[PDB]
Amino acid sequence: KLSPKAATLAERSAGLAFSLYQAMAKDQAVENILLSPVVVASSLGLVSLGGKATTASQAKAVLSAEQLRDEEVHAGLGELLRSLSNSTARNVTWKLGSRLYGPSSVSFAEDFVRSSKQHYNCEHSKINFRDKRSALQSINEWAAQTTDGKLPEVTKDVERTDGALLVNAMFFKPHWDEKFHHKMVDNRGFMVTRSYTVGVTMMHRTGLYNYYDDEKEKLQIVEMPLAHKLSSLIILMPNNVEPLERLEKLLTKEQLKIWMGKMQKKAVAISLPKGVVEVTHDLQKHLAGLGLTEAIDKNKADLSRMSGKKDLYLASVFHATAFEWDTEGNPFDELRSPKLFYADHPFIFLVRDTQSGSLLFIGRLVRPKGDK
Amino acid sequence: LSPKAATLAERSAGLAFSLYQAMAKDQAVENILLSPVVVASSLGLVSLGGKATTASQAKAVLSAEQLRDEEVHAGLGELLRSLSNSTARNVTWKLGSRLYGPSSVSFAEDFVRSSKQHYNCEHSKINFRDKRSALQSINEWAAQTTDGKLPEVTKDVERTDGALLVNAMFFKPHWDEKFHHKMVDNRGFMVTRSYTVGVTMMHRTGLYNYYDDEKEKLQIVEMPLAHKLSSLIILMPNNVEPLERLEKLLTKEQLKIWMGKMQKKAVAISLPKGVVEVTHDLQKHLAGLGLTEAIDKNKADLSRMSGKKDLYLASVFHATAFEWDTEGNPFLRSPKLFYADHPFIFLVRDTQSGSLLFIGRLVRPKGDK
């Protein structure tokens, strides 16, 4: 599969992903969560590639890769980024773009442009918030072009203007190994809370899925294989409507191994919301809480390897993803009593590359689109 | 319908609300099940066989003072016969009315003919000296009238020296859109928030006229019956609560306001499935509405029934077997839930003549705790 350096960085990006998820889940302001572990690691890798002194060491700090050299980190993350990006193309729809926006007074250094494009496929563009709407439109047009309109907008505003903006635009659409029938679709209610219901469209299918029912913890967990079993989507959900905080306290890497080992192929009636979930995170505050303190500081950032001068600081790290839940998948082929997996309330989901075991995605759906 | 039958349809509906409210305040009454046209026919029989104030009080409770005795009997007869045969094609409806007189009493021949011509009234003689044998004749006749669906009127008859008017009924609504006969399971019916009875429920989702009164926290839905000649309307609080508050709002004009606010929405209706059997003695309640002398041994003038003033209206038995079933004619946003697992009020209304065929409430279904 992947090289030794890409495999160890894959395990560290997964630990960083769960770890970033928990920090955002503890943030009372964060609702929907959607993180790509390799894209988050690449964002930190770019800071190490363009930073000096503590700015770069803190970037390798969050990555837990200080004991690694700069070259084997970039070569490892670069391979891991390109490997998982296309090992999950052939099966599911997956579009990724990374663009670094600098102020007009900034000139990107030539060595940083070459290595950041070779390792992380990073694009470089210059922007001016002179016309703040025109600047926002340039980002949204780039994101829409990268995702073919599936993500037509990154952010509605940019609070920090005098710095560098790293924008990752993503579109992910799981292609099921066994498709839902497009007529098994109707309008139902999604209970965001016990007192707040949003009208959504739901898709329904009953089949054989790896399933575990935890009567002790009062939760359901199901594994939905993606096309040709090259990856799988795992969903963790409480039995009844409740905040996901209790389930997240059980959400560890070791507890997941216990749940994965207890699953058995059972008849499961899976009902999922249908539609595109658009999530845009500015990981700046949350990456700072993990150790990336100086890179985002106007007064103490050393990003001189990006531009030649200490005129840049990391203003925002946009992690924007459009995640489409749809019925499409591979065609498939009778008296069992199906387990009910009725996902009309917040849940946690993981996308797992069945080959390398790498975490492709981690997130939670709290609020779908809909007028209530 | 004729002009006189049309006016009697509107006034029998007003009599239904007035009769329902009186029983709802009676702490001894649980389930209520009344057919307004059958009640109106009973008052017509008192007017047909009564004299002086006994007969005029019958038209008073009927609110038919502007009609004379001639047009009241002919109007109710057509109205009863119209609804009996205009709804003999859609829903199952079996009605019997029998007047039981003492054995020493001989029903006058003209009264037997006119009461059978207008009200299809049967006449029989009984003596409660052997109380068990007399009760069996009334209950055997009711079971015969309803083909076993109503095998029993009453377990005892307190007033023996008078006349007993017995109405036996079986009514089974036939939906314009049937429930699937497999969409049936066992659930809990909350009689109160502290008392739950195991019942069977039937479930269907479809387009129904619906109104949600968020201020009063009640739901009201219109279920069309077969071929849309009548509708079954259900009034229910959002959660389980005593019906006393909702009954206070239940008027003839308020029902017009609620029906006027309805819109066809997707509704998932869940109803108890089974036969509800209710037997009322309307004697006490009809007196409270104005029929005071007919039930009094010392001042009843029912001489047109039997030739002697030895008769008074002892009891007016109104016994109904009302079956909730899935059967009906064979036949989209996010449906509202009309989950009837707690007491509710229901009305069956003939959409053409506006006559109210039934009004009642289900407080206690059959079952165990």
Binding site: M184, D186, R188, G189, M191, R194, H204, T206, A269, S271, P338, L340, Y342, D344 | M190, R193, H203, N239, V240, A268, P335, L337, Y339
Partner: peptide
């Protein structure tokens, strides 16, 4: 094949 599952039940009493 069997149809979709029914909707979620109504809320409980207060």
């Amino acid at each position: 094949p069997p149809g979709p599952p029914g909707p979620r039940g109504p809320p409980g009493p207060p």
